[PDB]
Write a protein that binds this ligand. Structure first.
Ligand SMILES: CCCCCCCC/C=C/CCCCCCCC(=O)O
Ligand SMILES: CCCCCCCC/C=C/CCCCCCCC(=O)O
Ligand SMILES: CCCCCCCC/C=C/CCCCCCCC(=O)O
Ligand SMILES: CCCCCCCC/C=C/CCCCCCCC(=O)O
Ligand SMILES: *[C@@H]1O[C@H](CO)[C@@H](O)[C@H](O)[C@H]1NC(C)=O
Ligand SMILES: *[C@@H]1O[C@H](CO)[C@@H](O)[C@H](O)[C@H]1NC(C)=O
Ligand SMILES: [Ca+2]
Ligand SMILES: [Ca+2]
Lengths: 293, 293
């Protein structure tokens, strides 16, 4: 409902969201927006674990708006049982599969409001696999008639597409018992570990659904979703996969799991994937991690 | 409250460790067989900060003090289970601050009994400093009739919120916090550390010091949690000494913030020198980074 200001760094945006947990980023969920000729498809942004639409997209969303897209973002996976779930603005703690249902409702609203046939979708971290749930289980895709898919492009950053070894926690990654973390961390934390039930089910039979064009971006220095290459997808029949290492061609971009959202290079990569025939400017600028290394 | 963790050299790995073992002791600490030597006859008691514990706070300071020849002791205090943050593992000192003095009294008595010593020296990080001052003022850490028999001889602090904080790291967002809505979320300790809070008012009423105590009060120019940083400094009352130290004086490359610099070699030297004035302690000057970029 309220609109917060444009941001350039993740933790300031998070702090703002902790006092305004339902805020929208600039340029987002204007339900009067009409797709243009250059950009027929609305863009749906899907946040990550313990995050919201504001702290995830307070830079990406304004940039996509200035580029001429209609931009939309939901908040999802909200629950109040886990400890972290009780903190303001930490969403997407609920077990992940039903996220696809929430996304479906939202996407229907967006299509309904814009008269477009399809949307494009960007997902951060859990967002990505939440989006894939929608693709696989909740009608994002149409197995019998791929051309009718409601999602045309899935773009993701840091997505835990095949779970994470949590390499950044060092020796502590293995001490995490999948059974004791839900009450504290929330079930989604457990759903993103290696070979979780949800990920075995999500990946059973393949990474892709036909018709969808996937752009899967990872950062070398991501230490939340690890090894970082596990984010990459393998194309199945009738699908396209472009896996991008954020650093190939720009080693001075040191984005991590969080700072990648405020990297001008990542925004460029996203805009490129959204407008492949458009000569998009993909910068190569420095960007730092959140922590000092 | 007796598993011993490894020495650490960075704060966040220590905090992570503690989250899986929230009663861990830093090395060299709470050996109740330890007898103070003649060169260092006072035990050292370490008092942690808000949302912290003895491990993440002193997993560097304690091993270093132990190798310098002190008997080292540390407690966890201010544990409550009503606030949301208070429910997370190893985030202690969320309870309202004043009564922490009482816990410290208990602990100090067990230390004196265990070692035959007349006094202790004490070190406090952030809330630990004013919690320590609570003990000094309201729970018998000082003796008005006979200051010579104060149970505490030295109080050394770092980043202590001795006169409350403006939270300048939050910029204009700090003015947006409502002191009545944060207790349930962050713990009453957070509200007690705000400027002119009831607790700080009663604690500082009538002066910063008690007779017979030597105060070494350290702040860092880059501390942006206990702000303005100079507010930590104390004014000497009657029968008291205050040595107000800015960590960056004589070493502008030490860029420690509120958390790092618990892991600064310079800070550790400063504390060792305050403990051993006549001992020609080496105080290095070395580069140390903030926790964030
Ligand atoms: C150093 C990497 C360790 C693994 C990363 C784990 C935490 C990453 C969280 C990213 C989202 C924003 C953080 C806010 C919620 C913190 C909860 C937590 O620390 O588990
Ligand atoms: C993208 C998936 C991210 C999952 C990361 C979750 C783990 C990161 C570590 C967080 C600190 C450890 C949390 C401690 C909770 C233990 C609770 C318990 O079982 O008692
Ligand atoms: C949902 C209830 C809203 C009321 C406020 C909730 C606060 C959540 C945000 C906290 C940001 C950090 C505030 C830091 C104050 C700590 C004071 C200190 O450590 O000295
Ligand atoms: C969770 C363990 C951390 C212990 C203390 C945490 C401090 C939380 C307070 C945040 C409000 C202050 C604004 C942050 C500025 C960061 C600069 C610094 O750390 O010195
Ligand atoms: C995406 O990753 C798969 C394997 O994980 C690889 O076969 C494929 O070539 C990659 N695609 C691109 C465009 O890099
Ligand atoms: C801090 O202590 C110094 C001595 O180190 C003293 O001269 C000064 O007055 C004190 N500062 C304050 C604000 O009391
Ligand atoms: Ca919630
Ligand atoms: Ca503190």
């Amino acid at each position: 409902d309220p609109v917060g200001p444009e941001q350039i760094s993740f933790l300031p945006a998070k702090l703002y969201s902790s006092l305004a947990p339902t805020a929208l980023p600039p340029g987002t969920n204007d339900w009067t927006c009409q797709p243009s000729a250059a950009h027929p498809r609305p863009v749906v942004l899907v946040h990550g674990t313990w995050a919201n639409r504001y702290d995830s997209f307070a830079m990406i969303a304004p940039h996509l708006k200035r580029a001429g897209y209609c931009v939309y973002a939901l908040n999802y996976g909200d629950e109040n049982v886990s400890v972290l779930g009780q903190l303001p603005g930490l969403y997407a703690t609920q077990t992940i599969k039903p996220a696809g249902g929430e996304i479906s409702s939202f996407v229907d609203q967006v299509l309904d409001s814009t008269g477009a046939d399809q949307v494009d979708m960007f997902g951060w971290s859990q967002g990505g696999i939440a989006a894939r749930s929608y693709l696989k289980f909740y009608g994002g895709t149409n197995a019998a008639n791929p051309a009718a898919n409601k999602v045309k492009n899935l773009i993701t950053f840091g997505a835990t597409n095949h779970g994470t070894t949590l390499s950044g926690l060092g020796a502590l990654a293995g001490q995490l018992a999948p059974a004791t973390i839900p009450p504290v961390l929330g079930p989604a934390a457990a759903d993103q570990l290696i070979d979780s039930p949800f990920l075995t089910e999500l990946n059973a039979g393949g990474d892709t659904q036909p018709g969808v064009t996937y752009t899967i971006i990872g950062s070398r220095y991501d230490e939340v979703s690890t090894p970082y290459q596990r984010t990459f997808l393998t194309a199945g029949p009738g699908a396209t996969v472009n896996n991008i290492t954020l650093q190939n061609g720009c080693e001075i971009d040191l984005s991590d799991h969080l700072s990648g959202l405020y990297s001008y290079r990542l925004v460029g990569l996203v805009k490129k994937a959204l407008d492949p025939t458009g000569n998009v400017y993909v910068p190569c600028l420095p960007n730092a991690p959140v922590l000092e290394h």
